Amino acid sequence: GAHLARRYLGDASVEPDPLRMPTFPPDYGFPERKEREMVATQQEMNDAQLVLQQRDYCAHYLIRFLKCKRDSFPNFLACKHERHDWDYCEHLDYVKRMKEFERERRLLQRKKRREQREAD
Amino acid sequence: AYLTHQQKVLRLYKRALRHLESWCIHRDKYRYFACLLRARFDEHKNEKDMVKATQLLREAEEEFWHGQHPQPYIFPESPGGTSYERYECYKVPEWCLDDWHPSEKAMYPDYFAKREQWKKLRRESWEREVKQLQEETPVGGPRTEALPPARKQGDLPPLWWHIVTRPRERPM
Amino acid sequence: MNMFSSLSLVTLLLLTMPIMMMSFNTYKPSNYPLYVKTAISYAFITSMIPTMMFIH
Amino acid sequence: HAFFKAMLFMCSGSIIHSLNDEQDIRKMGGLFKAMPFTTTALIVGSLALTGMPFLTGFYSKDLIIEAANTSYTNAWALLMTLIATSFTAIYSTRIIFFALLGQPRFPTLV
Amino acid sequence: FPKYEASRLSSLPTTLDPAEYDISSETRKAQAERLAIRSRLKREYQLQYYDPSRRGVIEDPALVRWTYARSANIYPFGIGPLVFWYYVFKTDRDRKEKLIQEGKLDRTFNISY
Amino acid sequence: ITKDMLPGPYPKTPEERAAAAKKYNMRVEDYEPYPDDGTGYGDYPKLPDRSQQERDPWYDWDHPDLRLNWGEPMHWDLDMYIRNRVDTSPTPVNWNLMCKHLFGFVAFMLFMFWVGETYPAYQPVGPKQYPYNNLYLERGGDPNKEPEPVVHYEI
Amino acid sequence: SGYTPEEKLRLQQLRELRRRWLKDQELSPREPVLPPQKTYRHSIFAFTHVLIPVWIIHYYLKYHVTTKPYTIVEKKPRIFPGDTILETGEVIPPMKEFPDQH
Amino acid sequence: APPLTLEGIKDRVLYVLKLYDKIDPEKLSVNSHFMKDLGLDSLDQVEIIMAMEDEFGFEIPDIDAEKLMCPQEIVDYIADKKDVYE
Amino acid sequence: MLKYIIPTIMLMPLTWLSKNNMIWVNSTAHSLLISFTSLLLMNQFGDNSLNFSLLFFSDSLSTPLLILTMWLLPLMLMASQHHLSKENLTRKKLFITMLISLQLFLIMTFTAMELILFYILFEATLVPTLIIITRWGNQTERLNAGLYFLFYTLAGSLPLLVALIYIQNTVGSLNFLMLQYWVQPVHNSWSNVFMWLACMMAFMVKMPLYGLHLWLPKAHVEAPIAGSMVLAAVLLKLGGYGMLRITLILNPMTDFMAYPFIMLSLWGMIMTSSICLRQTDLKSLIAYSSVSHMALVIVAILIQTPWSYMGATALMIAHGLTSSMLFCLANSNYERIHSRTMILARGLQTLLPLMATWWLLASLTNLALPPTINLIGELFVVMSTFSWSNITIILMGVNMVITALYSLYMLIMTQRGKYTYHINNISPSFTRENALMSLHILPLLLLTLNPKIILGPLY
Amino acid sequence: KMELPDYKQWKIEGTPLETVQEKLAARGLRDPWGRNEAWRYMGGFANNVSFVGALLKGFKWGFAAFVVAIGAEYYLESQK
Amino acid sequence: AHIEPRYRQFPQLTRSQVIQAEFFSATMWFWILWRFWHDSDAVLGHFPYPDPSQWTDEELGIPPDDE
Amino acid sequence: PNINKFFKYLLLFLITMLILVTANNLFQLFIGWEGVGIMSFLLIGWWYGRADANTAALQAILYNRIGDIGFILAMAWFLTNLNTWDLQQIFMLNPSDSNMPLIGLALAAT
Numbered sequence A: 001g002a003h004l005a006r007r008y009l010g011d012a013s014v015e016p017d018p019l020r021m022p023t024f025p026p027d028y029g030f031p032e033r034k035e036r037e038m039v040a041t042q043q044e045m046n047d048a049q050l051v052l053q054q055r056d057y058c059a060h061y062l063i064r065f066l067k068c069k070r071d072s073f074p075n076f077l078a079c080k081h082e083r084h085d086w087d088y089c090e091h092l093d094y095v096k097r098m099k100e101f102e103r104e105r106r107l108l109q110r111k112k113r114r115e116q117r118e119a120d
Numbered sequence B: 001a002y003l004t005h006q007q008k009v010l011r012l013y014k015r016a017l018r019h020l021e022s023w024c025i026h027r028d029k030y031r032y033f034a035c036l037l038r039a040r041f042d043e044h045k046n047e048k049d050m051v052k053a054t055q056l057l058r059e060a061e062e063e064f065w066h067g068q069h070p071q072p073y074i075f076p077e078s079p080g081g082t083s084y085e086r087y088e089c090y091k092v093p094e095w096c097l098d099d100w101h102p103s104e105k106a107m108y109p110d111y112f113a114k115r116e117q118w119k120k121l122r123r124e125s126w127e128r129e130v131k132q133l134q135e136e137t138p139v140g141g142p143r144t145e146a147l148p149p150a151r152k153q154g155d156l157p158p159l160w161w162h163i164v165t166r167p168r169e170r171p172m
Numbered sequence C: 001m002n003m004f005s006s007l008s009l010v011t012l013l014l015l016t017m018p019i020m021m022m023s024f025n026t027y028k029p030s031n032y033p034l035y036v037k038t039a040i041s042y043a044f045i046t047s048m049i050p051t052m053m054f055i056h
Numbered sequence D: 001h002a003f004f005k006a007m008l009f010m011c012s013g014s015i016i017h018s019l020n021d022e023q024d025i026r027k028m029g030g031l032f033k034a035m036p037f038t039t040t041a042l043i044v045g046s047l048a049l050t051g052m053p054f055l056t057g058f059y060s061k062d063l064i065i066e067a068a069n070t071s072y073t074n075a076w077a078l079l080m081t082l083i084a085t086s087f088t089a090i091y092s093t094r095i096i097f098f099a100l101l102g103q104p105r106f107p108t109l110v
Numbered sequence E: 001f002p003k004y005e006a007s008r009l010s011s012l013p014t015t016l017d018p019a020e021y022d023i024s025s026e027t028r029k030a031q032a033e034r035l036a037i038r039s040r041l042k043r044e045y046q047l048q049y050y051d052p053s054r055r056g057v058i059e060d061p062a063l064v065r066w067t068y069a070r071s072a073n074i075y076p077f078g079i080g081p082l083v084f085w086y087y088v089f090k091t092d093r094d095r096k097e098k099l100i101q102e103g104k105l106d107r108t109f110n111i112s113y
Numbered sequence F: 001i002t003k004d005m006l007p008g009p010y011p012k013t014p015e016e017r018a019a020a021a022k023k024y025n026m027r028v029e030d031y032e033p034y035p036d037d038g039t040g041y042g043d044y045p046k047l048p049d050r051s052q053q054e055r056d057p058w059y060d061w062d063h064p065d066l067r068l069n070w071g072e073p074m075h076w077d078l079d080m081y082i083r084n085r086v087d088t089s090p091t092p093v094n095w096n097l098m099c100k101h102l103f104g105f106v107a108f109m110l111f112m113f114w115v116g117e118t119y120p121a122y123q124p125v126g127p128k129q130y131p132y133n134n135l136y137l138e139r140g141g142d143p144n145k146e147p148e149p150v151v152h153y154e155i
Numbered sequence G: 001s002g003y004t005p006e007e008k009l010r011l012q013q014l015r016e017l018r019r020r021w022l023k024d025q026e027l028s029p030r031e032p033v034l035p036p037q038k039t040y041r042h043s044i045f046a047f048t049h050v051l052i053p054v055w056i057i058h059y060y061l062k063y064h065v066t067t068k069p070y071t072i073v074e075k076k077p078r079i080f081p082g083d084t085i086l087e088t089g090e091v092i093p094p095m096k097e098f099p100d101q102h
Numbered sequence H: 001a002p003p004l005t006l007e008g009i010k011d012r013v014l015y016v017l018k019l020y021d022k023i024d025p026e027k028l029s030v031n032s033h034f035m036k037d038l039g040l041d042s043l044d045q046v047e048i049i050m051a052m053e054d055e056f057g058f059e060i061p062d063i064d065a066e067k068l069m070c071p072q073e074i075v076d077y078i079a080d081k082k083d084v085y086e
Numbered sequence I: 001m002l003k004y005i006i007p008t009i010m011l012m013p014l015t016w017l018s019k020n021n022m023i024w025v026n027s028t029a030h031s032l033l034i035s036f037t038s039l040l041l042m043n044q045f046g047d048n049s050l051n052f053s054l055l056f057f058s059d060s061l062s063t064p065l066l067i068l069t070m071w072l073l074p075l076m077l078m079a080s081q082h083h084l085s086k087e088n089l090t091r092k093k094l095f096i097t098m099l100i101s102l103q104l105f106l107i108m109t110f111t112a113m114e115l116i117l118f119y120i121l122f123e124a125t126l127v128p129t130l131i132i133i134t135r136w137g138n139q140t141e142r143l144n145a146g147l148y149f150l151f152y153t154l155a156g157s158l159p160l161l162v163a164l165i166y167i168q169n170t171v172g173s174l175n176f177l178m179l180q181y182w183v184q185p186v187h188n189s190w191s192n193v194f195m196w197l198a199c200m201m202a203f204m205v206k207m208p209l210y211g212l213h214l215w216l217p218k219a220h221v222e223a224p225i226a227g228s229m230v231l232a233a234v235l236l237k238l239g240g241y242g243m244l245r246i247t248l249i250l251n252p253m254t255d256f257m258a259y260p261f262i263m264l265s266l267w268g269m270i271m272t273s274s275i276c277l278r279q280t281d282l283k284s285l286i287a288y289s290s291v292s293h294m295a296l297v298i299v300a301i302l303i304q305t306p307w308s309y310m311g312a313t314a315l316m317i318a319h320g321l322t323s324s325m326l327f328c329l330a331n332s333n334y335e336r337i338h339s340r341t342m343i344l345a346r347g348l349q350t351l352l353p354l355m356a357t358w359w360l361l362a363s364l365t366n367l368a369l370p371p372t373i374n375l376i377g378e379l380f381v382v383m384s385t386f387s388w389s390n391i392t393i394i395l396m397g398v399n400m401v402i403t404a405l406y407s408l409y410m411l412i413m414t415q416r417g418k419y420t421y422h423i424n425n426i427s428p429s430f431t432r433e434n435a436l437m438s439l440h441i442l443p444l445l446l447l448t449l450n451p452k453i454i455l456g457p458l459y
Numbered sequence J: 001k002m003e004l005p006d007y008k009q010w011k012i013e014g015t016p017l018e019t020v021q022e023k024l025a026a027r028g029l030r031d032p033w034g035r036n037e038a039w040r041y042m043g044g045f046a047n048n049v050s051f052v053g054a055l056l057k058g059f060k061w062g063f064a065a066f067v068v069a070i071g072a073e074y075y076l077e078s079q080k
Numbered sequence K: 001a002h003i004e005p006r007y008r009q010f011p012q013l014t015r016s017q018v019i020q021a022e023f024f025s026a027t028m029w030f031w032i033l034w035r036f037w038h039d040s041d042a043v044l045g046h047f048p049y050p051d052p053s054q055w056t057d058e059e060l061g062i063p064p065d066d067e
Numbered sequence L: 001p002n003i004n005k006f007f008k009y010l011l012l013f014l015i016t017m018l019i020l021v022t023a024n025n026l027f028q029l030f031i032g033w034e035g036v037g038i039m040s041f042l043l044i045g046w047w048y049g050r051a052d053a054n055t056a057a058l059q060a061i062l063y064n065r066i067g068d069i070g071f072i073l074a075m076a077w078f079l080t081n082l083n084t085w086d087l088q089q090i091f092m093l094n095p096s097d098s099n100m101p102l103i104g105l106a107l108a109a110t
């Protein structure tokens, strides 16, 4: 995306480092952040034998989808609703990461301006 | 070269047309450029200065080399073709039938009765064939590989067996 | 476990049977290619059963 | 891939057989109507190969391409893969265009 | 036209060979002589090949000469490869032996040798 | 066969250079030994280092597959020049030009791949976030050693 | 550039023999003289190529392979919340109520 | 493939020649010499042999092709290569 | 071992008192019966070897070599009885006597407890082998081959005699069971460096080691078929068997004295494999393939690991059956065209379809296609050699590539392509020839079902 | 046994081979092999489809059965 | 055999092969249209891609620079 | 004429592939690995009288045994470091220093 052109051809200082993100404190500019809430418990995911890369903050929708898939056999076209709930939760989880990237980008810009405003 | 000047020109013409066909693909397009290529050969058809004609051939061969198709069309059974030698594994020499077990030969009583007439014809003709090649060859042995015909009724052309009884091109 | 393990192995064993009747002299060479084709078509059916159990 | 790639080879084998072991696409052409069923299989197989939506090839190729260009990945590799995807449609057109379309270019005894 | 540049694994085409076109009775005579030698050998082979009573192998002196020539001289690269490979392997094993002494080589599950 | 018909030592005089050519079924003008460097070639003829693929396909060879005639001298490296092995037939592109182009393509590709590794493509997305201290226990962590906590926050 | 009359005559003579040799390759009616000697077909095939093989394999696995430790190893069944265990009758609790985000 | 016959080959050889503008179909016979009786040159004969290679889908090497100087000789050549005896 | 020695000796009266036309039938039938009883040597225990008497003992190293030896005798008789058809009757009975006496020396060689008794029989095998090559070889060069065979062996054997005798003076016994308990370490010194060379160089020449191998291609090109079968199948393995025994008393000096010989073997196997690509003689090609295969055995013995000895034992058995089969296959071609040139007779799959199957199977084992015991032996040596030094995988990998190249080259050159027009005496394969090939391949493939019985004492 | 089509029927008129004759006739040339190629532009071999026309083979019938299906589908709901 | 070859002419076609080819070409197109009518998201896009330039600083917790 | 042999080879060609797919240890997997190489060699060189077919068949073996160098390397490494060829034990031990074994597998796949 454009974000790559900016980093590799423009100013790499005010572009987030994908490997080292985040770099500011979690609560810098956020009064009273809440923690993410996890529905499914560790045992439930252990029992359902979810792949570890699937044991994220959307696992309860995946476990709901997997159970319906097993009960609907052989109607492999059932469960379209459960599948979507899982996809949508994973979509919101993705937008959150985009927000974190943008927040890091804007903080890196503020830090830059706060210097030139300070340099003089 | 053992080829004459005519042979070199005609070989180039055929080869040039075949590579042109590979470039053109479409028949109407090939017909058009096949006529232009013929016209170039017709322009110099009547050149009499053989040094000049040899130059024209030399320059045409450099033109062909530059403009040849890197992957020209080859007939499937021609050398380098996709079917070349594909059936050689099925060609069994006729002498293999001599080692057939009697029970195998008894399945084709008629074929093996005819086969013995050929082996008889071959044995009785061999001496005349050898003699003919002796009386026709000059001292020092032959100078070319051309073989003579039979010069007499009842005679067979010398060295015919492996020509006549060679395997069929589709032997199975 | 019984059906799954048993039908997964007949699939492999079924395909070797035409090889046995060949390399051991016990079949009818009249239409061996049809026989070998039939074994594949039947081995496909058997293999599908363990696949359905895995999918389910 | 095992489906449409195997079909494509059987489709070429059908043409090669009908044209007495000719394998060069330059001596084919004009087979769209002469070989109706081979033509249909050769067009279905080519659209699957090139990722026509909802054919067998679309359910892997497109998932693979979108996962490649949204991944943390070598940028040159990502570009070569995409240009190659375009090439897949080109030589796919060569087979259809030269084997099926146009006028016959094969020998006279049909 | 860029001119052909022959190599060991890419000979010059005959149609591009200047020697292929310039011809003098010496070359034509030389070609006739070769065709004479070939035709004499061909006849000698054909008289035995076509003989109805011959069952066996027509021994070829040229094939006998070839095998004899190339199976005659033997000398099985002297110490250079052996010395080279010696230094590669000795250095590797000395390097590895030292680590095992110091416990710096990982052999946690190595119990097959 | 007989000794006089078998290969012998390097042919010194022009008369020995004539008995060799006769022995090998060659014109005395065409016959040439290998250089007398004591490599063991003896008087075997040095023949042009051309592949058998380069011979005429349409001629009626005594051995069609080898493209050889009975009695003609065999090249020293003939087993290396059979049609299944080394080919020397003329190429439509000059050898040196081919080597440049193939090397140029590969060298360009390896360089551009290194460039592509130094400036990777990626999406404008923060790190994926996992629950339970980045799944410390599931990933095989020691159940005894309470890990450094990882806390993720809503955004 | 064509055949010399001597070449034509040889080609003609070889051709006569060849076409006669090719004619003699044909089989007479009695040759080869051989020495004296869909449901149903598919049902025997199933019997001999599926049922008998699976009888032998099931016998082999049940009374030999599965009687040794760890010869057949299953991935244990997945247990989802709300399921019931056949062996013990235990009931797995459900997952706590979701945010019900949609 | 369909088998070839001596008259089948002859008919297709004369068919190609009749479709050649430089020949007069009424004067064309199996025994008509291309250079003597039909007044063609050796550049034409090259093209006739190529049209025969295209007709029957196989190649006639230049050494043999140069010697085929009437329709009957082409028929004899083709019949020999494909084991036609009819 | 008397139950094997005595019946083997009885084969001599049987041949000599047999009716004039029953020499091949009687010797073949009863030598096969002896091979049958040889399976009783498989009474092997986990801890203790099978020790019959003060003179003879049998462990899991010697047992498969004994069974291979007694199996090879009937096979040698079948392979020889055609080219000896015109031989004088009394000269037939003398040829069979040389083979029987070779078996006698071999079975006692592999079971002698003491190393001097092993040495005497190890050397006695020369006399019959020399006589077979020189008396019943075919060409002029069989006399030179006998001399190179004799003097290459003795130039190494005589120092070994001195070394063995010196060991008995210092240790007090050469009994192998006794040496297992009285073995003392060998310290650095020039006296020990030459004791190590004396103990090992006789066995190196037999393997043969690369550099000291040039006698072997001579012997093979000149020996009669039976000579080539025993020479390749068993006599080469005398050197390997002796090494696996005598290295017991050479530690730890083997740690550094092995370096020159591992480099010769590792590089020598690549060189000899590449030579096979340019051989014109089918027998010489198969000869040079043995040098390449036995290079692996030398390396395996010298690195002294449980996996390497297991691989070494399997190769010696696997190679023995494969190399003997290849020689028989080439000989069957030779008996028709009377030439060993590989390029002379081509496209033989067209004319001898079933013999092309044997050619294919022999080639597939020769290149070590899994799960043949040819590969089980090769793989174990590669596994252990990797742990010796990781770089060896490069040489090992290259050799496998080249090994497949000339194995299939030989198959393609002789069996495929177009047949040779003027060779018209290729008769249908005889029942004797077909049975001869099957009696090689069938045991070789059967052993993949129970490979433990050929893995040796460290299994 | 095989009967060949009458040779007089092959003509370059009305085919691209005729355009070639006009294109050559400008330069003073002639194609003497034109009629040997004519059969390729006549009869069932004339009027071959375009690439798009080839890809859209069966679309007419496929689209119709599609309308009859979504029509059937949207009717099985209106009742429900 | 039962399809007699023709010289320089369009080949003989059976009615079975023409219909089967046409039937399976319609099955393909029917399938594509039927799948596109229900699964257009698989081709165009499952979810709306957000525009990160519209997110307020209050959403992303960017404190004012004066601070 | 050898159609019966051809179907026997296609069947062996398939069996060795199914041994490869279901193999649960590296040695059993190697049996199928080399098995398809031989069956490929015997089926490419089907028309064995043709020199080009013999050359192509041997070319397939040559390039495939260059890859098999990497296969043996992975086998040698896994036995030395993890004491196993079984896939279960390889994944349970999950070695971190897996560059050498995987380069071997990558070369084999190449």
Ligand SMILES: CCCCCCCCCCCCO[C@@H]1O[C@H](CO)[C@@H](O[C@H]2O[C@H](CO)[C@@H](O)[C@H](O)[C@H]2O)[C@H](O)[C@H]1O
Binding pocket: D083, F100, F101, F104, F105, F108
């Ligand atoms: C979508 C495709 C993406 C991948 C594209 C990859 C592009 C790779 C380009 C590699 C080109 C390398 O090839 C390069 O070409 C020129 C032109 O012949 C060569 O040069 C050669 O031709 C010219 C003369 O005609 C001269 O430079 C020189 O006499 C000669 O050596 C270079 O020696 C060679 O290095």
Ligand SMILES: CCCCCCCCCCCCO[C@@H]1O[C@H](CO)[C@@H](O[C@H]2O[C@H](CO)[C@@H](O)[C@H](O)[C@H]2O)[C@H](O)[C@H]1O
Binding pocket: I188, I189, I190, I193, I257, I260
């Ligand atoms: C195929 C041929 C292979 C040839 C391999 C050659 C191996 C070379 C081995 C070198 C070591 C020989 O053995 C070496 O001998 C002397 C005994 O005099 C020992 O050394 C001892 O005597 C020497 C006398 O010069 C003193 O210097 C030394 O103080 C003393 O310890 C060494 O500790 C020992 O290492």
Ligand SMILES: CCCCCCCCCCCCO[C@@H]1O[C@H](CO)[C@@H](O[C@H]2O[C@H](CO)[C@@H](O)[C@H](O)[C@H]2O)[C@H](O)[C@H]1O
Binding pocket: J061, J062, J065, K018, K019, K022, K023, K026, K027, K030
């Ligand atoms: C799962 C969904 C399945 C959907 C299936 C839909 C039904 C498929 C009907 C296939 C009809 C096959 O029948 C075929 O149709 C085509 C097109 O009309 C006709 O083709 C028509 O146009 C061509 C070109 O002008 C003419 O050559 C032909 O004479 C003419 O009838 C064929 O004459 C007819 O044989």
